[PDB]
Amino acid sequence: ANSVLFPCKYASSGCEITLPHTEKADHEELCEFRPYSCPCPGASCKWQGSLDAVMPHLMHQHKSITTLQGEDIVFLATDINLPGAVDWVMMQSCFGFHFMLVLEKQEGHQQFFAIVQLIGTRKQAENFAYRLELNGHRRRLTWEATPRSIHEGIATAIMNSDCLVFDTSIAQLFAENGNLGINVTISMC
């Protein structure tokens, strides 16, 4: 109405936006010009930068991460019973975009968390859908959802169990000799 307009703290990065004190904090979390953290699971990489610098950062500092071409692929997590915290990471290239496919194992019983993350903006993320499948002897568990923008992260997603979640007992129904195959399918909508 008539409050004092205090501008965004990312205005010095091109955020030509000025708003009141009551809605400043809530813009800056969902701002386009906010910096992106490293999408890799775990806190080991403390990197930060822009969306355009992410792919470079991944390619330069994370050469170990493999990229498969295809809207429909198989993500084979190997040695799934190695005790302690364990991460699996890969990327999927489809629809002119890169997606990050993560499987986390968190330790009394151990639980698996599997999620897909668009390397792009939030609004870009809403155009897509992903599907994760585990397949066994007359058994099939399937999670489907909208991929998260790396701008959001998976921390709160994983904390809210807002993804494919399953314990090690399930794992054993779908795995052969410490190998779990996750049929990942990305699609548009």
Binding site: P41, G42, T66, L68, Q69, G70, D72, I73, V74, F75, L76, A77, T78, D79, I80, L82, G84, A85, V86, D87, W88, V89, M90, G181, N183
Partner: peptide, 11 residues
């Protein structure tokens, strides 16, 4: 079809 990536664990 479905190509297969053999991803290894990071601990």
């Amino acid at each position: 079809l479905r190509p297969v990536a053999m991803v290894r664990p990071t601990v």
